[PDB]
Design a protein around this ligand. Structure first.
Ligand SMILES: Nc1c[nH]c(=O)[nH]c1=O
Ligand SMILES: [Cl-]
Ligand SMILES: [Cl-]
Length: 228
């Protein structure tokens, strides 16, 4: 529980230190979620998954993907942005669009399922700007305190003596751009892959190959984006 236990128990070591400035804020978010349930509203993803992106090593992140907030359908969000469990089908629409662009950009076949854990395991941080949502209500937790947490995560990543490429999908993600200003960091910004915005510049954006060109140009290894 985010209300009950400290960062050193909840997230990976590097992340617990990176997020020290927002320790109280994370506990505050646990209190917010408690109050939601007391009031008769639910949240997604499950409590134990809310901070899941921060359970993969901070020091290993090479690419940052940021979306808006978790999927609003119960059974979709798993705490890694855009990912779904391997048994989920049909895929959410934004994921179908991501995968369409993945095939167009990289030439790989469509993935077998919507599980993005391989990316997380290979140094891609799958973040959302806001880490919870009320079921069926996109953006319902905007402005409730998560933004300070994800801002802190981005500043910390950018302050590392390491290369970073950021992929910011949509307007809420885009508000992290000012924090991504140091010379060790590069940002790719595009419209979000949701059907509402994807035709404004998501399709054709080639984020995966661009990220790899950027990594190689900073002397970093590219991401193996291939999903099974
Ligand atoms: N639209 C979205 C769906 N699911 C995500 O995890 N992030 C988003 O921005
Ligand atoms: Cl609800
Ligand atoms: Cl209500």
């Amino acid at each position: 529980s985010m209300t009950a236990r400290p960062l050193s128990e909840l997230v990976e070591r590097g992340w617990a230190a990176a997020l020290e400035p927002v320790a109280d804020q994370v506990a505050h978010m646990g209190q917010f979620l408690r109050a939601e349930i007391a009031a008769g509203r639910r949240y997604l993803p499950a409590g134990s998954n809310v901070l899941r992106a921060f359970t993969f090593p901070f020091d290993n992140v090479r690419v940052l993907i940021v979306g808006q907030d978790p999927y609003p359908t119960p059974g979709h969000a798993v705490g890694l942005s855009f990912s779904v469990a391997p048994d989920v089908r049909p895929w959410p629409r934004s994921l179908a669009n991501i995968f369409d662009e993945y095939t167009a950009d990289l030439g790989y076949p469509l993935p077998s399922n919507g599980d993005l854990t391989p990316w997380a395991q290979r140094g891609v941080l799958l973040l959302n700007r806001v880490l919870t949502v009320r079921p069926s209500n996109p953006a319902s937790h905007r402005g409730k305190g998560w933004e300070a947490v994800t801002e802190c995560a981005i500043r910390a990543l950018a302050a590392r003596a390491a290369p970073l490429v950021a992929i910011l999908w949509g307007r809420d993600a885009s508000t992290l751009k000012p924090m991504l200003a140091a010379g060790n960091c590069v940002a790719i910004e595009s419209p979000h892959p949701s059907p509402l915005s994807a035709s404004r510049g998501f399709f054709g954006s080639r984020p995966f190959s661009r990220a790899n060109e950027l990594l190689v140009g900073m002397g970093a290894e590219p991401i193996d984006w291939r999903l099974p």
